[PDB]
């Protein structure tokens, strides 16, 4: 038996006989959240402190 994040691909189905899949494979992207833009002194910020 062999088991991991193993993905069914046709070129491998030529030498090993995968079972029915137990979950779908999905491509994703990682990002960093936008922090926060508002502060109490934004009306004074046009001049340096």
């Amino acid at each position: 038996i062999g088991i991991s994040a193993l993905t069914i691909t046709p070129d491998r189905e030529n030498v090993v006989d995968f079972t029915t899949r137990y979950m779908d494979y999905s491509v994703g992207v990682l990002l960093r959240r936008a922090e926060k833009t508002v502060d109490m002194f934004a009306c004074l910020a046009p001049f340096d402190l």
Binding site: I8, R12, V16, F18, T19, D24, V29
Partner: protein
């Protein structure tokens, strides 16, 4: 979305060299008979300087280059989510496409006898829904922070409001305070000046 990632070019993105995802993008981008052209753009993000420019060598690198830097990383979504949930700052968030047909499955030797029994039982465990209870063990339903909201903007009409403006009201309140205290201290010292 990945479309909205692929349209812009002001944040660069890439993937680990010779990975399955790398060769899958290379395959998609070169095929002119492809229906969705997006990959043929993304490849020109990934191929830059013959593929030396935006690609990291090892899978730990990209996570840090993202967190400490101006980059994005393309990998297995079910892994990226498992990092994103467990970043202690909840500073990550992650997005991904509804790919299908390809999927995870147990391998077997050629002509092994087990194949039918397992293929039956995996289906029966999916129809029970047990494969969800045995899955919410690992990607839990919700944490302290939402999985995907990049910012809870609340601003939509662009107006100013009391909470954002009141820093100016503090200036007037300070003026009222100081001027009143000046009046009070003058009126008290009028007990002691000897002239008024």
């Amino acid at each position: 979305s990945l479309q909205d990632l692929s349209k812009q070019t002001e944040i660069p993105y890439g993937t680990v060299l010779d990975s399955a995802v790398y060769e899958h993008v290379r395959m998609k981008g070169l095929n002119p008979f492809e229906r969705d052209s997006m990959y043929s753009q993304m490849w020109w993000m990934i191929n830059r300087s013959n593929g030396s420019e935006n690609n990291v060598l090892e899978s730990q690198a990209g996570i840090q280059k993202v967190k400490y830097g101006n980059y994005a990383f393309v990998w297995d979504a079910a892994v990226l989510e498992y990092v994103a949930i467990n970043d202690p700052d909840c500073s990550f968030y992650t997005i991904g496409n509804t790919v299908a047909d390809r999927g995870y499955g147990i391998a077997l030797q050629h002509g092994s006898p087990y194949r039918d029994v397992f293929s039956q039982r995996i289906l029966e465990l999916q129809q029970n829904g047990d494969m969800d209870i045995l899955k919410h063990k690992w990607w839990p339903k919700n944490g302290q922070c939402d999985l995907y909201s990049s910012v809870d903007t609340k601003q939509k009409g662009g107006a100013l409001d009391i909470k954002s403006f009141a820093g100016v009201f503090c200036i007037l309140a300070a003026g009222i305070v100081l001027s009143c205290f000046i009046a009070m201290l003058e009126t008290w010292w009028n007990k002691r000046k000897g002239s008024r």
